[model samples]
Target: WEIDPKDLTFLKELGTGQFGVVKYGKWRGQYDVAIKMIKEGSMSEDEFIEEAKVMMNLSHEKLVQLYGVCTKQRPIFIITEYMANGCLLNYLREMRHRFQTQQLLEMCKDVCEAMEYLESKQFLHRDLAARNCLVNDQGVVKVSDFGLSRYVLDDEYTSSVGSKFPVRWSPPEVLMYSKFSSKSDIWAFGVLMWEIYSLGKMPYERFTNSETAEHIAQGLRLYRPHLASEKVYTIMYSCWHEKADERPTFKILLSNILDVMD
Candidate 1:
């Protein structure tokens, strides 16, 4: 069915990027959704088709759900579940000064739970950061932005176009452009932990992206945040271990996080 522009009552601009504009909208006569109107000629036909296929197959409660796609005309549209509260980054910024240890633990648990859920399905969220997570009215956390996510089988990895991934959150191997595994996600998780504790400070904000890349390539990691508990801090340190093989698997990482919080 053709999506009538008039039918899609634009609510607000959700977010924007090189690809297109994401807007809050409703379809038919029911259900609020986030619609990504792909920019015309932004990506090759093959690129667009591949991304669409990948999004359609992914399913997880923590992950945003792809409702339906519109590809009939130029600038294909992708409709997804609307997240009212916006990115977790903004939430962290708002709560940075007021958050207590208990609140931080709760946020950590929510993130690990979401990560564990994604690992269970053998999918890797290549671009995991505070900005990629979303929080709703109930304060439940949800992972969003699958634009860089991909599925991997046992002992499998895929190489694609490289973006300037968050240096603080990225593991050493990923920094070196070697290979990535679930362990890499753990490293990013650790950096995210720091971000939460520091109230949305970018990892290695002291340095430029290029400088951060240089240091990480040489096996340096972001200093652990000051406010995190001892146990939680330990886990974050382990995640940023120089050796990917030394990093804990998601299952082990989740277990450790749960123990610390409990």
Candidate 2:
């Protein structure tokens, strides 16, 4: 409940959101970690504590590690593993030319496997995007930003409110009816796939939010990225199926993503 700020030295700024700022830091001056200093009033202490319980118990290689937290303070600090390469979206955009398609596919595979694990654990990632993922210097891409949905805000992606769902990455069911499930995350992953293949281009860039929803309702969706092969696009296409039940599970998606990489 008590974490001394003096022991956690900020190494550098990472990113900032609606409620807090994430920074690269050292805990106990040895453990390389990312410190998420969330304003106390930004979210309820009980809510953060509840989410922290689930986060603290989760263990997966592709999932960002949660070290500890500070709750008995004005600003709550969430300590997590520091991923050196930073956000996955910018990483792909900056290294797209230098990286082979196989490398990119591997990143997606890592996320898919992580999501599969979460599925088995009965967890749902309401927000799944490259921007929500991080990459270490080892090129290991790990998912981040969980339990703090209300603290999230992406102007380009649409989220006037904290913990708002970004419509661009959501499936029709979620965007229309707010029906969320693992399959909905898969649908967002499809947009994530397009972002990766397109080198971080905005999904449905040409459409307005209302128009985008209308189009999706009318059975329209993002086109295949020019960089994506027909086979790769096929997997993504299945994720956006009109029926949630028809979409492949994360396990199946992981297998197919690996196949394309090979």
Candidate 3:
């Protein structure tokens, strides 16, 4: 749905990132929301509109809800569910000491459920990382940042938007071929699991993007985080197979994660 900018009240700025600024705001003077105000030149307006339509059509409890978009004006506004606890990356980092193994598994489970939903719809998230997911006041992490998503008719979507990809979170196919699919999402999901267990530490933290990509091509994978059990690391390892087809599906991942949790 398209929202009138006049009905939205911007209360304060929540944060800013590669796309633009996110503000804590009120919609229609009643509902709370987080508004992403787009920066010019960040993306094509037409392309964003198409992506917005796709995002609006999607519905899942584990996915951040897209309430509406403001496309009729300059600096487009994307309004979505507000998560008071902020992004999962910061939450995990700041409160790393507070979470137990069970809690970390729960976090991974939340994201896996959302990715499973997206995969079923044949949509490629393109970006899946702890930084892109948010934690609500209740501590439930919901997948966000549909800004890079695409609805693929087939399993593979070749991207022309070169250099926009997240290198450290990416797999070999994405780094070398610019190909995106649910499988690549699975790969990033693995890195996200590592992020949780690592307490939000950066993946390939010391490597340059080129170096990281080169290492991935050579079968170098992330080491197990101290918080990850052997079983948890095995799941993470399954996602980094050199061949994309060999990676586990989110459905299988969800089952495996539940097995771990159980």
Candidate 4:
């Protein structure tokens, strides 16, 4: 559904992203929504709206729902379901002491559940990180930040950039070549696990982008977070296999997390 800009009332700025500024707002004085105000020159507005429209039909409990868009004006507005607790990164950083291993695994399971759905639908998240996910009022973690998502019918997508992707969260393939697949996302999911367990610490904090690329190319990986159990660390380790085909699919990955959860 198309939304009217006048019908939306902005309450406050939620966060700023590479896309633009996101604000908490109310629609028609009734519905709660997060409005992404796309800034000019940041990206191609048409491409942004087109990609969002493609995701309009993807409905899942573990995935943030796209409500609608307002493209009839400058600085286009993207409306989506708003999470009360904002993004998982700040939430984890602020509430680290309150979380237990079980809760952390539950958060990982929620993301894996969403990713499995995306894999089934052939939608490549392309950007899967703790900061990109959101936590609802009930503490439910939902996969979001689809600005980089692509519907890959062939199961693989190669962008022209050849660089400028998320360096630390990216896999060796994406780092070396701009190639992306569900496998790359699986690699990111492993990093997301490390982020969750580390309470939102930046991955490879000590290394520069070039340094990280070199290390990943040499088969280096993140050390186990203090909070991750041995079984959990094993799963994280499996995701970083130098060969893309060696990484497990989200279907297999989710099952592995669920198995350890029980």
Q: Candidate 3: lDDT over CA atoms? A: 0.84
TM-score of 4: 0.90
Task: Give the per-residue lDDT of model 1 (tens digit) for 83-194.
Answer: 7788889998876366887778787778787788778766677777888888877777777765444322212123332343355566656756757778877888888888
Local accuracy of candidate 4 as per-residue lDDT tens digits, 82-125: 99998999999998385799999999999999999998888888
Better of 2 and 3 by lDDT: 3
Q: What is the TM-score of each candidate against the true structure?
A: 0.82, 0.90, 0.90, 0.90
Global lDDT of each candidate:
0.72, 0.79, 0.84, 0.84
**Model 1 clashing residue pairs (backbone):** none
lDDT of 2 by residue, 71-117 (tens): 76667788888888888888877873755677768878888888888
Candidate 3: Cα lDDT at 134: 95
Winner of 1 and 2 under lDDT: 2
Residue 196 displacement (Å), model 2: 0.6
- Tell me the spans in candidate 2 whose CA falls farther than 4 Å from its real position: 1-6, 96-98, 150-164
**TM-score, model 1 to reference:** 0.82
lDDT at residue 127 of model 4 (Cα atoms) = 81
TM-score of 3: 0.90
In model 2, what is the error at residue 67, expressed in angstroms? 1.1
Q: Model 3 segments beyond 4 Å from truth?
A: 96-98, 147-164
